[model samples]
Target: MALEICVKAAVGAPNILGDCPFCQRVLLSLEEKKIPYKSHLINLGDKPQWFLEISPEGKVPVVKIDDKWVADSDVIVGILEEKNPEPPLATPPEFASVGSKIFPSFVKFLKSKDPNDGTEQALLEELKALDGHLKVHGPFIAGEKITAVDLSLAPKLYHLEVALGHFKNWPIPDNLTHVLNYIKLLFSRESFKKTRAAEEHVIAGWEPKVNA
Candidate 1:
């Protein structure tokens, strides 16, 4: 029996991958670990009754574990790690929080209305922190081999890159060269290319959030 997973669908094009970072991480992990699973895409705009029954909150990346539905990416991550410990993707404790501040900072900056607000500054600060970590310990977030933290960071980085580029005409600083290359390396991986959403979907997905 294959593991059953529910994830987001594209806004206008429901058949393809949608712009959900958590879901991408789940898919990427499945791909990385060579797990056999069947994925069901949920139309978040008009969620299915059955899916709501499966997940009352209507969130994606919910996995069916032992005939019980589970929510939250962290909980899901734990489940995956414990049940299938074959090629471990666990990051060392110290490095686990590397780049963790990035996604929230990016969101604040993206939605920030005033150019002079500190949101942009906060975002850069987080990025540089990540850059500093990568300069010393990277090529991958936790080192040479990609781990769960890398999978978590990769999709968030993808959203930060695409969202910032599309909306703010922003580019990561040239001086943070390690982060630039890190983004390139992660985005180029086969797991990413297979499980990632299109740039347009990311843009479209966030446009409403910006408006709101």
Candidate 2:
């Protein structure tokens, strides 16, 4: 059975990697699990009719599972972990909620306009907590082996890195070395390299969001 995935195409550069972290998360899992699949890049702004038939919302990152098209990154990844349990990517249930707040906080901070607003502090606090966790229990989020949590967070952290640096001149604080190293490791991994969007596309993608 072939697994067919449709991920975002670059905004200006169609057919290239796009800026959706959700899409990349699925791609990362597919690559990490060494699951053979075909990838289709969907230009989100100009979706094709066939794609719309499968995905009523016209969202990218839809995949075929058991002859049915499944949407939502969380559902799709959960199914992947269940079906292919070999290089198991599930974080143990106990640590499932760890680092969960980081993404929401990052989005808030990225869209924030006020300097003294707590969004930056909120994001920093999330990163600080993650660094401490990685310091004590990790090289990866689920402790030594990479797991779904790490893959889920990787693209997000990459987006935070690019968007913050470009729009706000903000960067992860200097003291969070564990966090810094984790980003380096995640971004440099072979699987990520194969699936990540280029920095410019990431920048371009955020442009409209921030403007809006």
Candidate 3:
């Protein structure tokens, strides 16, 4: 059976790229791995019937892999990991847990910092730390190959760029050089082109407007 995916759409930020980070991650991962899946767009405010059926909380980016319904992004990542072991997404089983723990913390830290209060500095510090780790270890968070960690974190980098624009300091170093390199390499491939085309289509609708 084909894989089923549901993504929540932020209508208020219509022009803005989809804020559903998990959905973007899954989309990028599917593209990278050449996995086939269907995307269902859901309006977050008015809960969709299928969304509620698949996700009890009404949260989105839900995936129905065959008969099983996966609600959270992490869960979906796990499902993907199980579905495809090749081109593995996790570091060694030992470091895999560590990366998982660190992932959420870094995301939280990035989200918590105020755009006006030296967020660039915080991002750099975080990036430097990540780079330091990758420099010693391997190209990706989990080592040589792209893993769930890589997919989970990449979407936030774009958001960091968006938030950085709010402050005077607009440019932040893309942390995780290896990951950045991998993303670049991925983009260069035909798979990335498809993902890029989709992303561009999503971005084109975004128009920033002042309150009336």
Best-fitting candidate, measured by TM-score?
Answer: 2
Between 1 and 2, whose lDDT is larger? Answer: 2
Mark the 10 consecutive residues where model 1 has the least summed lDDT: 85-94
Q: How far does residue 182 in candidate 2 sit from its true spot (Å)?
A: 0.9
> Candidate 1's error at 117, in angstroms?
6.7
Over the stretch 1-212, how does candidate 2's per-residue lDDT look in tens digits?
Answer: 44657767777787677787677777787787777776587776677787787665786667665456777757767776666635565664434465667767776777677674476776777778877887888567778777888777787777777877887777666698888877777767888878778778887676677777
lDDT string for model 3 (1-212, tens) is: 45646666654443322555676666667767776666566655567576678766675666667656776767777785666534545434533454455555444544453453564455445556666667788666666656666667765444443433342234444655754665466555565445432333333322232111
TM-score of each model, paired residue for residue: 0.86, 0.88, 0.67
List the candidate 1 regions with Cα displacement exceeding 4 Å: 45-49, 65-67, 116-118
Ranking by TM-score: 2, 1, 3
Q: Best to worst by lDDT, what's the order?
A: 2, 1, 3
The CA-based lDDT of model 1 is what?
A: 0.71
The deviation in Å at residue 166 for candidate 1 is: 1.1
**What tens-digit string does per-residue lDDT give for candidate 1 at 118-150?**
767677777787778768865766767678778
Computed on alpha carbons, the lDDT of every model, listed in order, comes to 0.71, 0.73, 0.55
Which of the numbered candidates is closest to the native, going by highest lDDT?
A: 2
